[PDB]
Amino acid sequence: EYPTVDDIPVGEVRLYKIGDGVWSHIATQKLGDTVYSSNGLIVRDADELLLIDTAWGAKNTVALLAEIEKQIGLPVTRSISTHFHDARVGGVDVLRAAGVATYTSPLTRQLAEAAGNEVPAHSLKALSSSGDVVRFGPVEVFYPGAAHSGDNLVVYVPAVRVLFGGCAVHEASRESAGNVADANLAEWPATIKRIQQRYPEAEVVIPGHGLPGGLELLQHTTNVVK
């Protein structure tokens, strides 16, 4: 049932229910030749929603808000971007215009600014060193160390044991690491092991791109990176 690039045109967004009060959002973007599918997360907290990652640019992020209003009907009040690439902060200006309080790690804000990308408005201050973890509403945000990028974060929803790995985690079908220009290939396996050790009871693991799986995606990622 999980949507792929073939099911979603650029500019549309689908939601997919993952567990109680947890959905992923899936969108499509085209970079020159390449067409990607990309996942974020939505998590209910009382009568509001926490959003993890934009839908890759302003147009998709507008469609994301519309689809949330249509399907869920609760307001997105806060967001977290999991790394500095346009794929995850592109659209933060749409979120700000809709009144969302946008957050990420201080390092992500710095890298986004350096890259000329959109910059979330607020910093999650206790996330500075590999291993740092903070609670934020109904999730934990974990900085496990450098991997796909130096700043990449993962997000865990403890009530339902759902781990959003973002682009630090590859889907089962993926056999190459993608854009490695900001990656730390040497550190990535150790970063994965840190995720494994922290969330040994996770039931679903959602990669940055492609099909959700279980904890097996973590070791798979290490194998690919090598």
Residues in the site for Zn ion, rule: CB under 5 A? 85, 167
**Sequence letter at residue 196:** Q
Q: What is the nearest approach in angstroms of Zn ion to the Cβ of residue 183?
A: 9
Q: Which residue is nearest to Zn ion (CB)?
A: 85
Q: What is the nearest approach in angstroms of Zn ion to the Cβ of residue 168?
A: 9
Q: What is the nearest approach in angstroms of Zn ion to the Cβ of residue 135?
A: 25
Q: Would you say 76 or 168 has its CB closer to Zn ion?
A: 168
**Sequence letter at residue 138:** P
Query: 3-state class of 221 per DSSP?
Result: helix
Q: Would you say 85 or 220 has its CB closer to Zn ion?
A: 85
Please give the structure tokens belonging to residue 14: 């689908």
Angle at 48 between CA 92 and CA 40, to 5 degrees: 45
Give CA torsion, residues 79, 82, 93, 6, to 10 deg.
-100
User: What radius of gyration, in Å, describes the C-alpha atoms of the chain?
Assistant: 16
Q: What is the nearest approach in angstroms of Zn ion to the Cβ of residue 83?
A: 6
Say if residues 149 and 165 touch (Cβ distance below 8 Å).
no
Say if residues 169 and 221 touch (Cβ distance below 8 Å).
yes
Q: Would you say 65 or 183 has its CB closer to Zn ion?
A: 183
Q: Would you say 58 or 126 has its CB closer to Zn ion?
A: 58
Q: What is the nearest approach in angstroms of Zn ion to the Cβ of residue 182?
A: 7
Q: Would you say 102 or 117 has its CB closer to Zn ion?
A: 117
